[PDB]
Design a protein around this ligand. Structure first.
Ligand SMILES: Cc1cc2nc3c(=O)[nH]c(=O)nc-3n(C[C@H](O)[C@H](O)[C@H](O)COP(=O)(O)OP(=O)(O)OC[C@H]3O[C@@H](n4cnc5c(N)ncnc54)[C@H](O)[C@@H]3O)c2cc1C
Ligand SMILES: Cc1cc2nc3c(=O)[nH]c(=O)nc-3n(C[C@H](O)[C@H](O)[C@H](O)COP(=O)(O)OP(=O)(O)OC[C@H]3O[C@@H](n4cnc5c(N)ncnc54)[C@H](O)[C@@H]3O)c2cc1C
Ligand SMILES: Cc1cc2nc3c(=O)[nH]c(=O)nc-3n(C[C@H](O)[C@H](O)[C@H](O)COP(=O)(O)OP(=O)(O)OC[C@H]3O[C@@H](n4cnc5c(N)ncnc54)[C@H](O)[C@@H]3O)c2cc1C
Lengths: 598, 592, 289, 285
C-alpha cells in the first residue's frame, strides 16, 4: 500500500475505487482520548486509506497529538497524517514535533500556518518561527527530504479574511511549488462553486490532487453553527428540506445523509476520487454517508486486508510480514511485546531466529476495562460449564469480548462455528483456530488477503485448554493421526510435542502475480512458549477480577495452574475437519463441579 | 545426505536402503579425463551416495586428482572422497593437497600410507600419522577413512598385529574402513567379527570389484592374491572365451556375494568401477538397486544441486539455467553469498563473464556441424528443434542435455511453436499441487505438494514480435520480458522483484520456493543465449549461408520469456500464441 | 549541429541529441546508411548504428598524452574536478566531447558544475530556449528572422546507490521524461512511447518547421554503448591494476547513465533544480589494491 | 480501426463509449436528411456507427458507408447478411466496404440463396479467409443458442452486439451465462431509447420484449403526451444503462431509427454529451 498520500490519491483517481479518510482532533479528557482510540479502531473497519489528526496551540495539545500519532500508526494500524502549524511554534518546537512524527512511523504531514490561539484575536508568529505555511513546507522538505509527503490547505469559497480569488490561488501555487503533494480543502456546501474553483486551480498550473473537505450532518444546530462560523454557502433547497424536522435530529441525520452524499456523488462524477471526512470524533454522521454511497464494506465488496493479521505501520514495521498464529486475535499485544526488536521478520521466519518477546506486565498485555465492568461482561462462573457457556455465547456473537481476544468473534470462525461450540460445550475451551483453505481466490470475502488475483492457502489450526484428566486421551488420539502435529504445555512448564524439528511450520501462505510466495502466518516452539505464558496470565488476570477466595477466583486459578494448553496443526490442507472429528466424543469430567470454600 | 561418509554409512545401516559408491582413478590422456567426466555424470543417475578418486604418486597425478575433485563436487554435483598417500610426500605437498580438497568443498578423505611408485622426503611413516595430521590440521572438517585387508596384506601375514595397526589408524580418528577387493565371502564376514572383537566399532565398507572380462578378473584377482571359489571357477570355465557370457555369469556371482554381505547387516557397497559403468551397473541391476519408474531417483530440488565450496546452502535459482546447470555454477562461482530460501528484492547479483568462465558450446565445430547440419533458412532451425523435442537428436546449443519428460506433457505445443518459427529455448508446464512423490514433477521432502507456474521462452523475428507483445498484454495473467541483443528491454512487469514459478508445501516446514524469474538474471541469461547462438554460427565458415543466417538471427531477433501467473490453467500460454508465424521461414539469405 | 557534406548527407537535417558533441563519431557510425533522416526522424525508423569495436572513432591521441591532460584520478571527486575544469575552460578535452566546452553551457555553467561536484558526472546537456530570435549569438541557427526553441536536456552518470533517489525525484515531476540504463543492459524509463521526442525546433518564414534535434530510444541504446566504451578507453590509458584504471572500470561497470528531457520549455532550469540535494557517497574513497 | 480494440479500451478507461445504428431510407431525400443528421450527431462524439443491411438497399448501404467514412469522418460498421445472397453478391459487398475504408463488419421460409451460406458462422469464416484480419467481425432453447454463439465467435468474431432489451436483470444474468460457456469477447448491449409511446410499445411487442410494470405504470398517465413520455423514457432507459455500465459493460449501441433526439436525451441524462467543461476533443485543426 502507498505510504505517501499523494500516491494513494493518484491510484484512487486511476482505479476509481472507494477512497476516503477520517479527520480527528485531540480531546481534553484522557477519557475522551480512550473513547476516541476505541472509535478510531471501530471506524478502521469501514476501511479508510488514511486519517488526519489536527494540531492545536497549547503544550498538552502538542504532546497529546504526537502520542496519538504513535498509537494510531503502531497499534491501531492506521496510516496517519499529522497536522502541524506555525502558531506558538519556535523552530525547536517544529523540529521536535517533526522528529516525534518521524519516530512514530508517520510519512504524511499537513503544513499549515494555523489559526491563532484562544487567547489571541490576531495571528502573531512565535519568535524564531515561520510567517507562512509555504515556509514550513520548504522547511520539512529541507530537513527530512522526501520522507514526509506534505499536504496544504485550500479555500474554494475564499479565506475568512481574504476575498481576492486571484492572489489566493497565487499563494496556493507558492505553497504547492515549495513541494506539497496534495491539497485538502475547507468544508463546503456549494458544489458548483467547488468544481468551478477546481478548474481555476488547474488553470493556474496547480496540478496536484485535490481532496474535498466533507463535513456530514449530525445535528441541525452543529450543522448551521459551524457552517455560519466558517461562512459557508448553504443551498436554500438544503434549508427547505431540513426545515420541517429541524428539532428531530434522527430525521435531520437521515436527510443530511442524502444531502451530503448527493454533493459527494457530483464531486465523484467530476473525477475527484478521494473524500476527506471531518468526523468531529463521531462515527455515525460519516458512517451514514459512507453507507449512502455503498462505500462501506459488504459481502459484495468486502474489506481489503494486506495480510491475514492486522499489519503494524509502526517505526520500522513497514517490512514486517510474518508472525506466529498465536497473536492472531491479540495484535496490539504482539506489537507491545516485539516493540524493542531491531529487525522484524520478513518473507520467512527462518530456523536460526531466536525471538525475545517482551514482558507481560511492563508492556500492558493485560485485561481491558475495569474489574467491575469485566464481571458485568463475564458474570461469576462457579464451575467449568459456566465458562463453556460464556465461550459459546462469544461464538454466537452474544457477548463481544473474552480474555484471549482483543475483539469479537471472527467471520473466519463463522465457517467452523458449530464445531468450536461443540468443543466448548464438552469442556475443551477453544482460545484460537483457523479453518483449512485450499487455494481460495485472494479476494475471498472470508479468507481473502494480500494482492488481487492471488490464491491463498491455510493449514487447519486449533488451540484449546483441556483438563489434565482428559489430556492423555487427546494426546493418544492426536498421535494416532499422521497428518497432525501438536504442541501441549502446562503452566508448570512441561512441554510435549510430536514435532519433527524446532523450525517454523507454515500455516498460511499465498501465491501472487509477479511476486515471491507470501507466508505471513507460522507456528513455532519458542513463540508458543512466549504465548502460553500470556495465555495463562490472561486467565489469571480474569481470576483477579473476582474477590480473593471467590468460587470464580478459585475456579479460574485452579484451572490455569492445572490445565494443559494444546495447539494442533493439520498438515493436510486438502481436508481440514479431520481435527474436529478426531476430538469428537471426548468430554471433561465435573463440568458442574463447584470448588468448595466452607 | 550428510556430508560426512561416516554419517551416511550409519544411516544406511539404519534404514537398510540401497547405499553404494563408485571409485574412479585419474586417466593419463586429457581425453580419457573428459570421457570419465561424462561417465561419472551418467553413473550419477544410478544414484550413488558418494564417489572416490584414487591418488597416484606422480606430480601431475596429484594436480589432476585435485582438479577432478573440484569438477565432481561443484559441477557434476557428486559428493567425493579424495584419496591421499604418504608416497613421495613432503608435508608441504600434503598440506597443499588438503587445502585443494578443502576449497573444492570436499569433506571426506581416505588416509593411506600408499603403495610405492616407506619413508619419502621425511614425510609420514604410517597412515595413522596422516590420519592424526588431518585431524590436527583441519579439526573435524574432513571425515577420514582408512584401508582394510580381510585376506591379509600382501607382505604382512600376521592377522593379529594387522588388526592392532587397524586399531591404531582408527583410534587416530578415522570414521570408517574401506576394504580391499575380496572374493571369499565367508572369510570376510569372519574377519568382520574379528575386527569388532578388537574393539574397532567403525562402519566397514566392502570393496566390491565386479567382473568385466575373464582376463582382467583373474589377472587383478591373482595380483591381489584373492581366494576365488572353485564354484566360481567351474561356472565361468565353460564360457571363459565369451566375455558376454562371463559378464552375465559374474553379474550373479558377485551379486550373490553382495546379498550375503547385505544380509549380514553391512549396508554400503563400494564398487571399483575401473572407470567403467557396465560391470557395476549389471550388478546393481541384479540387486534391483538401480532406480526404476516404480522407485525413481529422488530429487532434493527441481534442479541439480551443487556441492561446491559455498553451495551447500544454495536452494533458489532463476529458471533460465534449468538446462545449463554447469553454466550457472561457472558464472556464479565467485559469489561470496549464495541465495537461500528466497531470492529477495535487494539482491543485485553480479553474474560471471561468458568467455572468462568457459560457458560455450561442447565438442568440435566439425562435430557440431555433424549434429546440427547446415541450416540455410529458419525452417531448418525449426526442424532441428522439433527433432530434439522428439528425442531424435540429443543436444541443442541452449541445452546441456536431451529433451525432458516434463516437456513430454506439452511436447506437441512446443513442436507447433517451433514449426511456426517461434524457436523455443526453455519452458516448463504449470503444475497445480502434484504430490511431492510425482515421478515427473516430484521433488523435495515426502508427503508434500509441489506447484509450478507455466513458463515459455523463445526467439522471435522482429517483424512478428509486435503482434506477440500485443497478444501477451491483452492477457492479465501473463507477465513477460522481451529483449534484443542490441539492448532494448520491454516488459509488463509490476516490479523488478523476483516472481516465484516453482514452489512446494511440506509438512513441518516453511514454504520451499526453488525456482524464480527475475530481471537482472534474465539480462545475464540473454547475453549467454545470444552468445550460444553466435558460437553456433562460428561453427560454420565465414561467408556461409548457415553462418550469415544465424548471425543475422541473433543480431536482429527478440528473446521473449513469459510467465503465466495462472497455475490453474497452464496451456493458456500456448493457446494465446496459436496462429502466429514468422514471415519467410524458407528464405535463404543471398550474401551480397 | 555540425552538418556533414558526405556522400548521401547533403539532405541530412535531423539527428539525436546524443552525438551533439561527437559529430565525427555519428558520421562514422551512420556511414553505411542508405537513407539519411530528413525533416523528421519518424516512428517507423529502425536505425542500425555502426559497431564500435569494428573501429570508427574513439579517444584521441596517445595514452601518454591523455594521462597528461586528465592526470591520475584515484577517487570520484577527482573526476568531478576534471569535469568542473572543462566547464571553466581550464582543460580543453574530455572523453565524451570532440571539442572544448560550449557557450550554450556557459548559460547553465554553475548548475552543471554543482551537479559534477555532487558526483552526478554530466556527459551532455542543453538549456531550454523559448523562442529566441534565430540570430541569437548563442542559440541562433538556421534562416534569418526565425524563432528557435529547445527543450532542456540533461545526461549524466550516477552511482547505483544514489540512482534510486534520482529516479524517485524525476518521477515526482510530470513534465520530465527519462531513460536510465546500465552497462549491464537494464533499461528503465517513464516514456509513453518508443517514438522520437523533439528537443530542438525552429519556425522560419516561408518554411516548414525545422526540427534538427530529437531524443529516441534505439539511438540512446547505441549511444550508451559508446558512452561506457569511452569511459573504458579512458581507463585503458592507465596501467592495469591502477587506482585510476580500477576506479574508471568499476565506475563504468556499475554506474547508471540517465538522460532527462524537460518537456516544459517555458521553465528550463527546473531540471537542475529538481536534482538539488542529491550527492554520491564516498566521493573521496580510493579503491584499494 | 477495429471495434474489438475500441470496446476493450472503453472497458479499460471506463469513459463514455457509444455508437449509433442507422438504416438506409428509401427516398434519396431521406438519405440526404440522414447524412445531415449523421453529421450533427457526429458532434455528440460516437466511437462508431452501424449501417443495417436489407434485401435489395444493398447498393445504397455501400454508397452510405463510403459517405460516412470519407466525408462525414465517421468510423462505420457495415452489416451483412446471407439472405438472398450468392457468394458473388457477398464478395461484391465486401469489396465495396473494403474500398470505402471500412474495417468493421457485422418468402415464408428463410431459404439459403443458392451458392451462398446457411449460417452466419459460415460468413464469419468466409470474411476471415477472404480478407484475413482486415475486417473485425461482430455477430448477433437457451443452451443450444449459446452453443451456436460459441461457434460464430470461434469462427473469428471480435465482439457481440445484442438485440434490444428492457429486462436488465435478465441481461446481466445472460452475460455471465455467455462467459460461463467460454465466450470471452466484448459484449455490446442494444439500447433502443423511447421517442413515442406508440413506437415504443409497437416495436417492443414485435420483438417480444419484457417491459417492466413500473415502466408501464410511469408512462401510463402521460401516454398521449409524447413530450412527457420522452422526458420520462429518457430516465427509464438511462437508469437501465447505468446498471449495465455499473456492471462493467462499457459500450452502449443506440438504435437511433434515423432520429437524434431520443438518443440525445439519454446521452444528456448520462452526461455523456460533450460540454464546455468537457469539450469534444479534436485530433487536428
Ligand atoms: C483540512 C484543513 C485542516 C486544518 N487544520 C488546522 C489545524 O489543525 N490547526 C490550525 O491551527 N489550523 C488548521 N487549518 C488552518 C487554519 O485554520 C487557517 O485557515 C490558516 O490560518 C490559514 O491557512 P494556511 O495554513 O493554508 O496558510 P498560508 O497559505 O501559509 O498563509 C495564510 C495567510 O497568507 C495570506 N496570503 C494569501 N495570498 C498571499 C500572497 N500572495 N502572499 C502572501 N501571503 C498571502 C492569506 O490571506 C493568509 O492571511 C486547517 C486547514 C485545512 C484546510
Ligand atoms: C580402498 C583402498 C584404496 C587404496 N587406494 C590407494 C591409492 O589411491 N593409492 C595407493 O598408492 N595405494 C592405494 N591403496 C593401497 C594402500 O595404500 C597400501 O596397501 C598401503 O600401504 C597399506 O597401508 P595402509 O594405507 O592400510 O596403512 P598402514 O596400516 O599404516 O600401513 C603400514 C604397513 O606397515 C605395517 N606396519 C608396521 N608397523 C606398523 C605400525 N606400527 N603401525 C601400523 N602399521 C604398521 C602394516 O602391517 C602395514 O602393512 C589402497 C588400498 C585400499 C584398501
Ligand atoms: C444488432 C442487430 C443487427 C441487425 N442487423 C440486421 C441487418 O443488418 N440486416 C437485416 O436484414 N436484419 C438485421 N437484424 C435483424 C435480423 O438479423 C434479420 O431480420 C434476419 O433475421 C437475419 O438473421 P438472424 O436474425 O436470424 O441472425 P443470426 O445470428 O445471424 O442467425 C444465424 C446464426 O444463428 C445460429 N443459428 C440459427 N439457426 C440455427 C440452426 N438451425 N442451426 C445452427 N445454428 C443456427 C448460427 O450461429 C448462425 O450463424 C439485426 C438485428 C440485431 C439485433
Amino acid at each position: 500500500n502507498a505510504m505517501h498520500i499523494r500516491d494513494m490519491l493518484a491510484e484512487a483517481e486511476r482505479t476509481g475505487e472507494p477512497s476516503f479518510s477520517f479527520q480527528y482532533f485531540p480531546p481534553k479528557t484522557a477519557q475522551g482520548v480512550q473513547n476516541l482510540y476505541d472509535r478510531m479502531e471501530r471506524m478502521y473497519n469501514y476501511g479508510p486509506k488514511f486519517i488526519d489528526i489536527t494540531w492545536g496551540a497549547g503544550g498538552r495539545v502538542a504532546e497529546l497529538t504526537c502520542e496519538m500519532v504513535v498509537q494510531a500508526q503502531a497499534y491501531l494500524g492506521l496510516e496517519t497524517c499529522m497536522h502541524l502549524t506555525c502558531t506558538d511554534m519556535g523552530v525547536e518546537r517544529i523540529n521536535d514535533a517533526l522528529r516525534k512524527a518521524y519516530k512514530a512511523g508517520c510519512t504524511n504531514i499537513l503544513a499549515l500556518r494555523g489559526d491563532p490561539p484562544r487567547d489571541k484575536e490576531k495571528w502573531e508568529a512565535a519568535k524564531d518561527g515561520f510567517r507562512y505555511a509555504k515556509d514550513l513546507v520548504a522547511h520539512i522538505r529541507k530537513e527530512y527530504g522526501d520522507h514526509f509527503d506534505i499536504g496544504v490547505a485550500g479555500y474554494p469559497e475564499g479565506c475568512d479574511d481574504n476575498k481576492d480569488e486571484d492572489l489566493l490561488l497565487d499563494h496556493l501555487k507558492e505553497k504547492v511549488d515549495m513541494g506539497a503533494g496534495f491539497i485538502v480543502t475547507q468544508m463546503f456546501y456549494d458544489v458548483d462553486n467547488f468544481l468551478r474553483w477546481v478548474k481555476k486551480v488547474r488553470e493556474r498550473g496547480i496540478s496536484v490532487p485535490i481532496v474535498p473537505g466533507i463535513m456530514p450532518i449530525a445535528t441541525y444546530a452543529s450543522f448551521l453553527r459551524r457552517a455560519n462560523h466558517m461562512k459557508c454557502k448553504i443551498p436554500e433547497e438544503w434549508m427547505a428540506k431540513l426545515e420541517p424536522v429541524k428539532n428531530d435530529d434522527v430525521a435531520v441525520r437521515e436527510i443530511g445523509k442524502t444531502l451530503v452524499a448527493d454533493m459527494c456523488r457530483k464531486i465523484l462524477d467530476a473525477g475527484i476520487r478521494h473524500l476527506h471526512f471531518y468526523t468531529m470524533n463521531l462515527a455515525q454522521a460519516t458512517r451514514m454517508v459512507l453507507e449512502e454511497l455503498n462505500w462501506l464494506p459488504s459481502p459484495d465488496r468486502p474489506l481489503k486486508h494486506a495480510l491475514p493479521w492486522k499489519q503494524s505501520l509502526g517505526f520500522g514495521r513497514r517490512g514486517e510480514d510474518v508472525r506466529p498464529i498465536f497473536w492472531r486475535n491479540r495484535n496490539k499485544s504482539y506489537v507491545a511485546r516485539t516493540q524493542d526488536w531491531d529487525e522484524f521478520p520478513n518473507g520467512r521466519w527462518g530456523d536460526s531466529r531466536s525471538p525475545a518477546f517482551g514482558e507481560l506486565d511492563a508492556y500492558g498485555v493485560g485485561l481491558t476495562g475495569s474489574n467491575e465492568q469485566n464481571r458485568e461482561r463475564w458474570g461469576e462462573p462457579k464451575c467449568i460449564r459456566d465458562i463453556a457457556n460464556l465461550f459459546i455465547r462469544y461464538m454466537r456473537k452474544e457477548i463481544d469480548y473474552l480474555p484471549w481476544s482483543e475483539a469479537p468473534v471472527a467471520d473466519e470462525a463463522d465457517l467452523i462455528k458449530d464445531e468450536l461450540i461443540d468443543l466448548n460445550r464438552r469442556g475443551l475451551i477453544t482460545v484460537n483456530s483457523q479453518p483449512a483453505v485450499n487455494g481460495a481466490k485472494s479476494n475471498h470475502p472470508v479468507h481473502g488477503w494480500g494482492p488481487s488475483n492471488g490464491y491463498v492457502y491455510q493449514k487447519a489450526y486449533l488451540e484449546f485448554f483441556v483438563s489434565p484428566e482428559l489430556y492423555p486421551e487427546i494426546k493418544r488420539r492426536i498421535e494416532s493421526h499422521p497428518d497432525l502435529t501438536y504442541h501441549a504445555v502446562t503452566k508448570s512448564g512441561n512441554l510435549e510435542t510430536n514435532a519433527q524439528s524446532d523450525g517454523p511450520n507454515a500455516v498460511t501462505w499465498g501465491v501472487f502475480p509477479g511476486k515471491e510466495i507470501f507466508q505471513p502466518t507460522i507456528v513455532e516452539r519458542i513463540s508458543f512458549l512466549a504465548w502460553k505464558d500470556e495465555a495463562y496470565h490472561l486467565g489469571m488476570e480474569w481470576a483477579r477480577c473476582y474477590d480473593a477466595g471467590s468460587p470464580s477466583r478459585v475456579l479460574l486459578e485452579e484451572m490455569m495452574n492445572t490445565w494443559w494448553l494444546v495447539n494442533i496443526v493439520n498438515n493436510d490442507f486438502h481436508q481440514g475437519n479431520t481435527l474436529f472429528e478426531i476430538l469428537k466424543g471426548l468430554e471433561v469430567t465435573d463440568l458442574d463441579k463447584v470448588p468448595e470454600t466452607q
